Design a protein around this nucleic acid. Structure first.
Lengths: 60, 35, 87, 94, 147, 102
RNA sequence: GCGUACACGGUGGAUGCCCUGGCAGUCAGAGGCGAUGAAGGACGUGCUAAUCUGCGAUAAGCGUCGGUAAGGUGAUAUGAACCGUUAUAACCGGCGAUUUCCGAAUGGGGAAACCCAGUGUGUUUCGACACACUAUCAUUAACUGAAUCCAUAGGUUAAUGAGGCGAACCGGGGGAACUGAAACAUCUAAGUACCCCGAGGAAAAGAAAUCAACCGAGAUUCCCCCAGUAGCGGCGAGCGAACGGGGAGCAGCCCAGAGCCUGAAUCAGUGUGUGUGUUAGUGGAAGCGUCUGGAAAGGCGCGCGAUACAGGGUGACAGCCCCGUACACAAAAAUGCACAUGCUGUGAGCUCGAUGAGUAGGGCGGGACACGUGGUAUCCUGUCUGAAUAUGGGGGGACCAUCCUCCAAGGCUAAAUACUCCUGACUGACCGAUAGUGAACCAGUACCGUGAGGGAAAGGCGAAAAGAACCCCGGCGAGGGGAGUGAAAAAGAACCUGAAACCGUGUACGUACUUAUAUUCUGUAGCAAGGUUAACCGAAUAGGGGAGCCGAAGGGAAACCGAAGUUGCAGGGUAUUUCCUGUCCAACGUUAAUCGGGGCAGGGUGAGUCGAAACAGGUUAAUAUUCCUGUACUUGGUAUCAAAUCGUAC
């Protein structure tokens, strides 16, 4: 988890993070605004994942 | 607008009097030094 | 408008209200929150990219928060669709 | 022995005291009949207190409903911010 | 009167036999108590006189015991406990010369038992404890220092 | 390095549960220890139409300080001290009185 | 109608108890932070309506390495929802990235969190977006370069120390009044308050052309004694010394111009390896029964460890319940100090000569020096004069004679030393919410004032929320009564004990001279012609430290004859968003108001044709010519598309 995605090149990391931002964040926000999403751990999980991904791509 | 021009943060800080009164207010610890 | 990260950071979440509820069926109009900027073209492009719903007219207005405590003023956007509808 | 006290009543002490002075030592039914037509504002409050007391007594001491008698009714000055008051009623068959 | 070797010890009369001076002892103890970092200096000769007077008072009450030696083979508090139980001593003081590391280490936890060297003897320690156990070398060191 | 953890048997030294054994369920972040059948309470739950209210009076368990309970070992049948000792690769708890291994 | 005493209650806040708080000190660090963006603020920051705290669009957290690791997702303060449980849950620490805006702010404007620029690079779509750069002295050299051919003044280029904040202190320059003289001039007041300046953690000074004079030791820096003595002072109040005689520490050197042998201790910065601290941590002893007691840690009985009875929590005071203490250990990486170790530069002593020339001094005029130019001493002027070099110079105590450290016109010198904005540890015969801090509480908060500035009241449930289920009256509120948890509800949240003052019903009867410097007297005690030793050393009220302050085999005229004082103490006197929707009558309405001119939560403002271009109708509880209905109209690009931000209620 912490280092599983370290080896893969930058292009796939960028693709994954942009896909996450475009789909998961928007879906979670829509569900939260509409009253759905009884479980909110998805927001924290995606936020942590994107933070980890963007922390890379600069030192590499 | 006269109040802002006269006792504004920048208006005071322009002169040394504003800086010293700001330091005194900081020492006192009031939430707002000027407004 | 080559970059796509900027546009997707404008809209935050939809707004739910009785007037919005009536509008969703009166003319298939929706209300979506946006960021400080009021770039109508960018908002339309982002909506088209995300929901794949064509938009013809977007109406933007500014709302000031109510109080000392203060809240950031927010931009309200009404978007209408020809025939498609989305959540 | 049934006790019922209403606290923080928004009424001056003197008016409630002088209203209750006309009910102390008299039968519950007779006092109720007298106060049915009373127009004083404190009359409504004292009626509420006494009817609540009688209802509680019947709920817990339903026996001998007819012979209920007013025993110890009084008013005391209440918290001051229009000074409030506390109206207390103790009622029993004897 | 060593109580262990039936050996008598020679002591100066002026040390353990001088007349008790209540006022001087009271002044010295008051000064010592007040000299605990609360808002007194005492003359050296007055201090020596107070120490000699209190020692004489304790001697005439049979509250002081002298032994040939006092040491523990190992730094174990059990040995000291057994040794003090042998003489039926519970709240007593130990006065000696050079401080023994093992004995001091073992006696550290004992609230009722405290060990001190000849040079580090004070009226408070002597009075706070019912009896004191002393050694001949300690006796002569005290005689020399107090004069 | 808590001396009490999940899935253990303990005995309440004092607090109306003297001589009665129990099984520890969980320990609160503040040190409170919950042990089955040590202190039964009749808390009155606030009625609520939603959340599938059980109704009546809920018979849950209260919380007591860990100081009032002690580890129990079936080898001797009496509570004793518990210490920590280093094993070949890890550190594990152990009792006293010949130091039965956990 | 009242009174004489008690009980039952109320606004009630003194006493009693609690401290998650303050106040006074000691020991060490640091003794400052900051454009690679300081201190302080605005705004976001979670499943969340508000606060502390962390964080800064990666926003109660992200990457790597170590400890514990089965609980955790920080708390107020619950609830829904998840991960892991033997090493990728979470917590702590080293090393890094991110580090919104204002704030010296330093891209421009500007009103703090607001609006808008220029340069290079990055460009699946050169419309749009991302990173870096910006305003100041001269120095290195260059592009260069008027007056004035060269040259200079000046602009630019790549770097260097700075242009702010912060408690005290070093030294210097300015700088008033209040005061004794019952007012006042010289003094004191007072070099006091206050402003500025150089860098600092300490600073200045710091090693003799200094002192007595015919005898001596010479660095500066602080301290008791000398000495509160001389002297000054309407000789009154008061101020106030040194060569001299003891402790902390005591290191004097560099150039002065030539050489000799020289990379010879050593200086300053950077690797290597060890130890001891810091930045997470591990192990670390022992008991029960019995009786009250809600609960024992309380009484009683017998035992155990103790290198650990310091301390805290645990249903009442606990060595043997837990956390801890001493003690024994521990560092992947960073970090202060010690050394041996490698390198870029000064980097041992010896001989030859010397003591730093417009220099000291003097004449035209003034600085604080009481001395304003008076007989007038001290740096020097805008100005003139002005000999040397141990063979010479300065100083004297009567001058001649004779004596003394030393060599002035080049510099430095960490050692003992004042202070605490802050960090870590401890103590207090210090205080208990009108005390203690202005503030123990969401306090430098509410509140007052244009600003400056001034500045409060308000702390407490319960051992454990186990927070009164359930039922009834009641208006679905508010409130109360049964039952029950609870020891106790004479603990019910407006929540510790609860007195009076004031108001109700019943009961028996009539109707405020302060620490402190001295003087004197009283008691008490050591020693004894002796004791008393200050500052300091010090295993610390022990032992040393008699450079002092008094008395005395002396008295006496200095011819002569031959004993008892001090210091410790205690006692005393004297000298000084207002629009609408849902809720409510509680803060207000000169009665009530379930009414409102009143609080809370939500909603509402829609633009190419409102600021060359739009007319009529409809719209919700409030907005329109803006949203829909009929299309029309000005401009531009390619029948088709577009014309930004900003306010449209009152």
């Amino acid at each position: 988890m912490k280092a599983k995605e370290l080896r893969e090149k930058s292009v796939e990391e960028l693709n994954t993070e942009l896909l996450n931002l475009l789909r998961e964040q928007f879906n979670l926000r829509m569900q939260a605004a509409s009253g759905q999403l009884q479980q909110s751990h998805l927001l924290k999980q995606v936020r942590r994942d994107v933070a980890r991904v963007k922390t890379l791509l600069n030192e590499k | 607008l006269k109040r802002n021009r006269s006792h504004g943060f920048r208006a005071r800080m322009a002169t040394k009097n504003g800086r010293q009164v700001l330091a005194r207010r900081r020492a006192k610890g009031r939430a707002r030094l000027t407004v | 408008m080559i970059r796509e990260e900027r546009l997707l950071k404008v809209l935050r979440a939809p707004h739910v209200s009785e007037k919005a509820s009536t509008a969703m069926e009166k003319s298939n109009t929706i209300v979506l929150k946006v960021a400080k900027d009021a770039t109508k073209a960018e908002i339309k492009a982002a909506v088209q990219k995300l929901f794949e719903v064509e938009v013809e007219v977007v109406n933007t207005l500014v709302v000031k928060g109510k109080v000392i405590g203060r809240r950031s003023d927010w931009k309200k956007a009404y978007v209408t669709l020809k025939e498609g509808q989305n959540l | 022995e049934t006790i019922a006290k209403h606290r923080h009543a928004r009424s001056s002490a003197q008016k409630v005291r002088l209203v209750a002075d006309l009910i102390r030592g008299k039968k519950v039914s007779q006092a109720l009949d007298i106060l049915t037509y009373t127009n004083k504002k404190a009359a409504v409050l004292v009626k509420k207190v006494l009817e609540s007391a009688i209802a509680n007594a019947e709920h817990n001491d339903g026996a001998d409903i007819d012979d209920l008698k007013v025993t110890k009714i009084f008013v005391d000055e209440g918290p001051s911010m229009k000074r409030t008051s506390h109206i207390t009623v103790v009622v029993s068959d004897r | 009167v060593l109580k262990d070797a039936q050996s008598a010890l020679t002591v100066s009369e002026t040390t353990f036999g001088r007349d008790f001076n209540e006022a001087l002892v009271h002044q010295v103890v008051v000064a010592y108590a007040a000299g605990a970092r609360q808002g007194q200096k005492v003359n050296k000769k007055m201090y020596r006189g107070a120490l000699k007077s209190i020692l004489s008072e304790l001697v005439r009450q049979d509250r002081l015991i002298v032994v040939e030696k006092f040491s523990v083979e190992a730094p174990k508090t059990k040995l000291l406990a057994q040794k003090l139980k042998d003489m039926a001593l519970e709240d007593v003081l130990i006065i000696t010369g050079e401080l023994d590391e093992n004995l001091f280490l073992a006696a550290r936890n004992l609230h009722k038992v405290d060990v001190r060297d000849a040079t580090g003897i004070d009226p408070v320690s002597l009075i706070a404890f019912d009896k004191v156990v002393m050694t001949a070398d300690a006796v002569k060191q005290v005689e020399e220092m107090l004069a | 390095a808590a001396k009490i953890r999940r899935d253990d048997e303990v005995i309440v030294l004092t607090g109306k549960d003297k001589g009665k054994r129990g099984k520890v369920k969980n320990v609160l972040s503040s040190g409170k220890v919950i042990v089955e059948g040590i202190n039964l309470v009749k808390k009155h739950q606030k009625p609520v139409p939603a959340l599938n209210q059980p109704g009546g009076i809920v018979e849950k368990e209260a919380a007591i300080q860990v100081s009032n309970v002690a580890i129990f070992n079936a080898a001797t049948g009496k509570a004793d001290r518990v210490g920590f000792r280093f094993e070949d690769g890890k550190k594990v708890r152990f009792f006293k009185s010949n130091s039965e291994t956990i």
